Structure formats: C-alpha cells, structure tokens
C-alpha cells in the first residue's frame, strides 16, 4: 500500500497528473519511487551493470559490503541509473533500483537522414563528461545498432535509442564514471537547443498552481 507524502505525490495518486511528461515540463523533483512505478509500471525493466564488493574500513575491522550499479530503463522513452552500497547483495540491488527510479530522465530521439517514421537515434552529437571519462554519442543511420562498449550499449538500449555511434576517451575502465558519463550524455539530449525549439514557450500553469484547490483538502 502507498500513502504519498509530497504534494506532487498526492496529485499523482489520484488522476490529476496524466503523464510523466507534466513533471518534466516543470522540472519538478521526483522524490517518491512510487510516482515512476505508477506511470511507467510494467514497462520498466532493469539491468544490473556491476556488483563490486568493497571492504569498509571500520574500527571493528573489515566487513564486506556490495556496491550495485543498476540501470533502469523503460524502452522507447526513459532511463535512470542508480548506485547503492549495502551489507547484503539483494538489499544493494533493490536500493539501487529505487534510487535509479528517482533519477529517471527523458531522452530526446532524433533522425539521421530524412525524418521518416519513428525517431531512432540521438538528435545531435552530444557528450557526457564525468571524471576523466568522455562519452560522445553520434547520430547513426537507421538500423546500424548501438556501436559501443557493453555498458553504454546497455544504457542506450534501455533508453530506446536504436542506433548510435559512440566514442569514449579517458579511463573508461572505471565503471561508475563510464555509466555516469553516458547517463549525463543522454540527459543532455533535451538540454541541447536545436532550430526545432525556437518558438516562444507558452506557459501552462504548474501542477501546484493548477490543482491548488484540490490540495486544500489534503
């Protein structure tokens, strides 16, 4: 059973917010895991990228705890990435998943050649810089597939990108930096301005400002 805490959460619970896009439009923070699990639901699959065991330096000695890198992704839309460290491995995994659901971003999908059908590739060649790891995504023609290292291959697949030329620079061996770089690249797809979004942005009322009277009752 879910009982929401945030104002956004309460709105979600009912039927006042229709899609996940209304949250992203106003760049509101998704603070509850259930909101994502409500809108996307069964569509979100997960891939555990890595389980690395680390020994924590304690005054009692050394105990083993596992760090889980999980990339959650609804295909043809949304990706997230989470990193959790815990005593048990299942715990670490679920924690990572929860954390990765809070981090779900939309990816803009573009066209390589002439814009026929559904979008398949990254809109323009974007980059993701994260601690000496430099990931570049490049628009690829339809049906090329993701030509990358295994990790950003996963991440791009779960983003719903069909095809993309990748190039990495720096210490790509450190997985955290690599995955985080690629996530950072993929987020940046919406942040990049094209001639497509030049029209003066007409302002809709914010979820708070629109359903203010319904939030009085709670």
């Amino acid at each position: 059973e879910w009982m929401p805490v945030t104002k956004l959460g309460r709105l979600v619970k009912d039927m006042k917010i229709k899609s996940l896009e209304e949250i992203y439009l106003f760049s509101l923070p998704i603070k509850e895991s259930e909101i994502i699990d409500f809108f996307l639901g069964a569509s979100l699959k997960d891939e555990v990228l890595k389980i690395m065991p680390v020994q924590k330096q304690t005054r009692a000695g050394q105990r083993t705890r596992f760090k889980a890198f999980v990339a959650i992704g609804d295909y043809n839309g949304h990706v997230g990435l989470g990193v959790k460290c815990s005593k048990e491995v299942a715990t670490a995994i679920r924690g990572a998943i929860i954390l990765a659901k809070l981090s779900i971003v939309p990816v803009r999908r573009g066209y390589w050649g002439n814009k026929i059908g559904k979008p398949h590739t990254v809109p323009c060649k974007v980059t993701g810089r994260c601690g000496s790891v430099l990931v570049r995504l490049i628009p690829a023609p339809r049906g090329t597939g993701i030509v990358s290292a295994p990790v950003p291959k996963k991440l791009l697949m779960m983003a719903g990108i069909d095809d993309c030329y990748t190039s990495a620079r720096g210490c790509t061996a450190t997985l955290g930096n690599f995955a985080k770089a690629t996530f950072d690249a993929i987020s940046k797809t919406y942040s990049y301005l094209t001639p497509d979004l030049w029209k003066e942005t007409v302002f809709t009322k914010s979820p708070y400002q629109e359903f203010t009277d319904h939030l009085v009752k709670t």
Binding site: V48, I51, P53, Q55, G61, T64, F66, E88, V89, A90
Partner: protein, 325 residues
C-alpha cells in the same frame, strides 16, 4: 637435537638481525640478508616451525616470523660447536627460575657446565634482556677468578650462554650436617671481607647462593646483583650478610661464633666495582659491493609483493556475491 647443519645457521641469524631493530620480522627481509641460497628458504622456515625454533605471526597486517625461547638457545650452542667447546649433551639439569643449567661435553669428553638465561612486555624485549645478563655475569666471573676468588672458571660467552667449570655439589640450604662447622664458617666469613677488600658487596649473600664441594670448599655463583662500596648504605648490606651467616650456623649446625669480623677496608685491592693510486684488487672489491647492493635492493622489492594473504581474503567474498545474485 641438531641434525641439520648448513642453511639453519644463516636463516636463524637473519632473524636475530631483524630482532634487534624490530618486533616481528617479515619473510621478505630474511632471504635478502641471507643471499647464499635463494628461493628454497621458505621450506626451511616450515622445518623450523616443526621444532620450537621460530613462531609465526599473522595478526591483522603484520605478517612474518619471530624467534622463540628455545630457538634462541639453539643459536648459541651452534656457535659454541664451532668454537669446539660443546659436542654432546649431559642430562643432569637443574631447571631454575632465572636460568637453566645444562651439562655439556667437549671433544675430549671433559664435562663442563652451561648456563642459559631464561628471563620471562613482548618476547623480543625478553630475549634482549637475557643478552645483557650473560655479558654482565661473565664480566664478574672473569674479574673474580683472576683475583684469587673460589668461583667457577669462565670459558666462553655466546649471546645468553655462559660456559663454566663443573663444580659438582649441593647448595647450603639442603645440608643436614658438616663434619667441620668451624673451618667452613671461617672460610665463608673471609670471603665477605675479601669482596669488601676488592670494593664489592654481594647484597644477597645467603645460604641460597652457596654450594659446598664435598663439605670442604665453598663455591659462589649468580652475579647480577652486585653493588659498589661507594653506596651510602655500604655497611648495611655488609652487616646484613654477616648476620645471615651468623644465625644460619647457629640454627642448622648449632655453632656459635668466636670471631666477629666487621672491618671496613676500601681499597687495598683492585677496584672491581667498575666491572692509478688505487690497486685493481681494491677496485674489484669496491665494484663487487656496488653490484651486490643493486641486486639486493631489487630482490627486496620482489619479496615485498609476497601480498598473498590480501589476495586470498578478497577471493572468498567474490565467490559468495556471484552465487547469491
């Protein structure tokens, strides 16, 4: 017993080199300072742990070996064997609290007495305090024998071992009767005046530190407690030792004293209280010393990678993580 007589010398001495500077000595350091044989010293260490020669230590981060009580004892006997003093072992052993008495026999077959100091802070400090004890005891043993005193004859000292003349008898504490009590009493009273003449007070001159040889001759042992006559309470320690003997002969043998020696004579005797120009032969030796040091430094870094214990602990957890996933 001692069967192995080659590599065991070099390995055990290498431990003693590290023992003087540090606590537990790692196996990485041992092979570098024992460069005569390389690689096969690790199986020698596994033969040393079979006996009470070395002890293993793997606490938390400190990995290596330390020398034991009995292991320190074997090293001295191995040195005394090369000096041709000890060959076979006699079995008459008086196990004490501060020292152990072992009968030793040479090449000739002549039986001598050996003292081994067993002081029992970490074991490293305990095996260093035994080193200073033997060197101090041998110093007094040489000083008294040269100056006419009835002491065991000093022969050789090695780390903690002291070889002395075999005077066989019984300690004064376990004596029922003496055939001539008066002559023995006057002999013992003379020896306190003798020491005071040389500027020495025994301090603990009791019936527990005197041995009779066939109820005729009084022998003195155990000398780490001796003090100078320059001490403010010089006459107090002098009179306490006199009264200890005065009462004992009256107690055990019922002999009352006619002579009462209380003379202060310092000092009529020796004060023992203190106790193109460079030739190619040289060029070769100097070049060799440089080339050995370059090789020894590289071997140290190769042995420092042995961590083997760190890799074993990390592998166990990884197998558990993959199986649970």
């Amino acid at each position: 017993l001692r069967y192995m007589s080659r590599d065991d010398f070099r390995v055990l001495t290498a431990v003693e080199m590290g023992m003087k500077n540090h606590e537990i000595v790692p196996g990485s350091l041992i092979a570098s300072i024992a460069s005569l044989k390389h690689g096969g010293c690790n199986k020698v260490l596994r033969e040393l742990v079979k006996h009470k020669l070395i002890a293993w230590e793997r606490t938390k981060t400190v990995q290596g070996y330390r020398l034991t009580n009995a292991g320190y004892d074997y090293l001295a006997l191995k040195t005394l064997s090369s000096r041709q003093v000890v060959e076979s072992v006699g079995n008459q052993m008086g196990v004490g609290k501060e020292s152990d008495i072992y009968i030793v026999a040479n090449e000739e077959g002549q039986q001598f007495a050996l003292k081994l100091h067993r002081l029992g802070r970490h074991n490293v400090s305990w095996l260093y305090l035994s080193r200073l004890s033997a060197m101090k005891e041998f110093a007094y043993m040489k000083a008294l024998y040269e100056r006419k005193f009835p002491v065991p004859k000093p022969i050789d000292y090695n780390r903690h071992a002291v070889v002395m003349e075999l005077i066989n008898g019984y300690p004064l504490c376990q004596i029922h009767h003496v055939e001539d009590p008066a002559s023995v009493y006057d002999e013992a009273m003379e020896l306190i005046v003798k020491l005071a003449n040389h500027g020495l007070i025994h301090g603990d001159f009791n019936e527990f530190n005197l041995i009779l040889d066939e109820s005729d001759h009084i022998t003195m042992i155990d000398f780490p407690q001796m003090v100078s006559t320059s001490h403010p309470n010089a006459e107090w320690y002098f009179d306490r030792d006199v009264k200890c003997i005065k009462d004992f002969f009256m107690k055990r043998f019922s002999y009352e004293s006619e002579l009462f020696p209380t003379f202060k004579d310092i000092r009529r005797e020796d004060t023992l209280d203190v106790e193109s120009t460079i030739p190619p032969e040289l060029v070769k030796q100097k070049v060799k010393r440089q080339l050995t040091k370059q090789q020894k430094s590289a071997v140290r870094r190769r042995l420092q990678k042995g961590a083997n214990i760190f890799t074993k602990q990390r592998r166990e957890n990884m197998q558990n993580i993959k199986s649970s996933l």
